[PDB]
Amino acid sequence: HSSGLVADPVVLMETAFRKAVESRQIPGAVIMARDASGRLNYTRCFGARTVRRDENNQLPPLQVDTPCRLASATKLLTTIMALQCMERGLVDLDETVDRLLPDLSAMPVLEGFDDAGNPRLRERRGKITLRHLLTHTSGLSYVFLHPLLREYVAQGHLNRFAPPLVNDPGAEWIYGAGIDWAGKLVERATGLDLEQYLQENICAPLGITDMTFKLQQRPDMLARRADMTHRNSSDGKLRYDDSVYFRADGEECFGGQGVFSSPGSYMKVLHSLLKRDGLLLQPETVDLMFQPALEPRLEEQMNQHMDASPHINYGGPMPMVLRRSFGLGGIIALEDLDGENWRRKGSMTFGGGPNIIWQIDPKAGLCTLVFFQLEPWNDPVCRDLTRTFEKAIYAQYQQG
């Protein structure tokens, strides 16, 4: 036409999400991207927050303000809370946790079992520090992940705080309860429960009114929450899952998994970190979070473990084989994911069990999130849709 007078990657990506909902591959999704400047403010919602039909045989929509189970996306929130304690001089990242976590310090290491089935417990060697807790290098694991803890529970010997360690601090990178113990350290250092601490130090500075460990105390959030959806392994179909986490909060605030919030409120956290606006942490402390924390020996072992474990895939949509490290808050990419087309070296990421993925990319000046409420973790459809979203957004952002 006439200037001034009266195949898109992003449009194609949005169509892909819409088709995934229409074909019942996913219940719905929320995708968000923000840049440091504020110029990029992209939010899109697709489909439903459940597969359970309401009284009118309708599926309630999944929205930017829908309360969701964050699962392991809670770990970044707890990391920030522990780092605020450090900034306020309540804890040193390299001092022993003995002073605030004598109960964790008293925990033995489970070595194995004797030929009669009796557990073989020994004393932990070396100090556990808050830096070990935040980097998953304390020797703490998870019952569902470790074969020794799996055997220890199956025999009837045992709550994220209860299991013995499986290694000494600094021996190896092991995904586990270290963030739950970092949350407990925050409570001990401040004299507040993690819920009150979260409200005063993460929520209030960002104007967040829907982020809590105590969902049962929020009937407004209960009325609007997503339900969990499960993909059946037998036929790949979507089913309603009555998640125990949506029924009761429990007494303990589990820093590694327990927060419920909306995608919109979670993006406020990511965006504050990307902008280094000082609302949650000093800019120097945010820079520290993105620094590779592992010595060469642990970096090599973590990479060998992850490259060999695509069935676990902590990295979610990141390439299966990549040079990574771990910072304070998530996995750091030590190389560009795909040259100038996608996440850059230095970007940090983590996920939540229901296929939630967050990433902050300081070099590119972008942060993105994808929320699903679909289990199990590492779902191929969610993975592919997340890669498609990120790649389309990076393309549009760089084009100008």
Residues 6+ apart with CB under 8 A from 72: 256, 257, 350, 351, 352, 353, 356
E-strand stretches of the chain:
28-35, 41-47, 68-69, 109-113, 119-122, 228-231, 238-241, 260-261, 324-326, 331-333, 348-352, 356-361, 366-371, 374-375
Both structure tokens of 85: 């304690």
Distances (CA, A) of 180 to 198, 253, 328, 356: 14, 8, 14, 19
Dihedral, CA atoms, 19, 23, 25, 26, nearest 10 degrees?
60
Q: 36 near 365, Cβ under 8 Å?
A: yes
Distances (CA, A) of 353 to 283, 322, 389: 29, 21, 19
Query: Phi/psi at 235 (nearest 5 deg)?
Result: -120, 0
Query: Phi/psi at 143 (nearest 5 deg)?
Result: -55, -50
Number of domains in the chain: 1
DSSP state of 340: B
Q: 96 near 129, Cβ under 8 Å?
A: yes
DSSP state of 166: S
Q: Characterize the bridge pairing of strands 228-231 and 374-375.
A: parallel
Residues 6+ apart with CB under 8 A from 197: 81, 186, 187, 190
Largest Cα–Cα distance in the chain? 86
Q: Which among 338, 354, 388, 353 is positioned nearest to 368, based on CA atoms?
A: 388
What is the residue whose two structure tokens read 């000046």? Answer: 365
Residues 6+ apart with CB under 8 A from 340: 398
| DSSP H or E segment with residue 301 | helix 296-307
Q: 49 near 373, Cβ under 8 Å?
A: yes
Which residues are 29's β-sheet partners?
46
Q: Characterize the bridge pairing of strands 348-352 and 260-261.
A: unpaired
Distance CA 162, CA 150 (A): 13
Task: Cite the DSSP H helix spans in 69-208.
Answer: 74-87, 102-105, 130-135, 147-155, 178-190, 194-198, 204-206
Exposed (0-12), middle (13-18) or buried (19+): which is 243, by Cβ within 10 Å?
middle
Coarse DSSP helix, strand, coil percentages of the chain, rounded to the nearest 5 percent? 35, 15, 45
Both structure tokens of 278: 């000082």
Distance CA 196, CA 213 (A): 10
Domain span holding position 380: 1-400
CATH number at residue 334: 3.40.710.10
Count of beta carbons in the 10 Å neighbourhood of residue 213? 23
Both structure tokens of 38: 């504020």
Distances (CA, A) of 269 to 38, 68, 276, 393: 14, 15, 11, 20
Which residues define the annotated binding site for monacolin J? 69, 160, 175, 245, 375, 377
- Is position 72 annotated as part of the catalytic site? yes
Both structure tokens of 107: 């925990």
Coil, strand or helix at 80: helix
Distance CA 366, CA 186 (A): 29
Dihedral, CA atoms, 240, 242, 245, 251, nearest 10 degrees?
170
Which position among 3, 23, 37, 72 bears the catalytic label? 72
Single-letter amino acid, residue 230: H
Distance CA 255, CA 181 (A): 8
Which residues define the annotated binding site? 69, 160, 175, 245, 353, 375, 377
Which residues define the annotated binding site for 2-methylbutanoate? 353
User: CA torsion sign, 79 to 83 to 84 to 90?
Assistant: positive
Residues 6+ apart with CB under 8 A from 129: 93, 94, 95, 96, 97, 169
Residues 6+ apart with CB under 8 A from 385: 16, 17, 20, 26, 29, 370
Distance CA 366, CA 359 (A): 8
Distance CA 275, CA 94 (A): 27
E-strand stretches of 196-335:
228-231, 238-241, 260-261, 324-326, 331-333
Single-letter amino acid, residue 45: C
Distance CA 131, CA 97 (A): 10
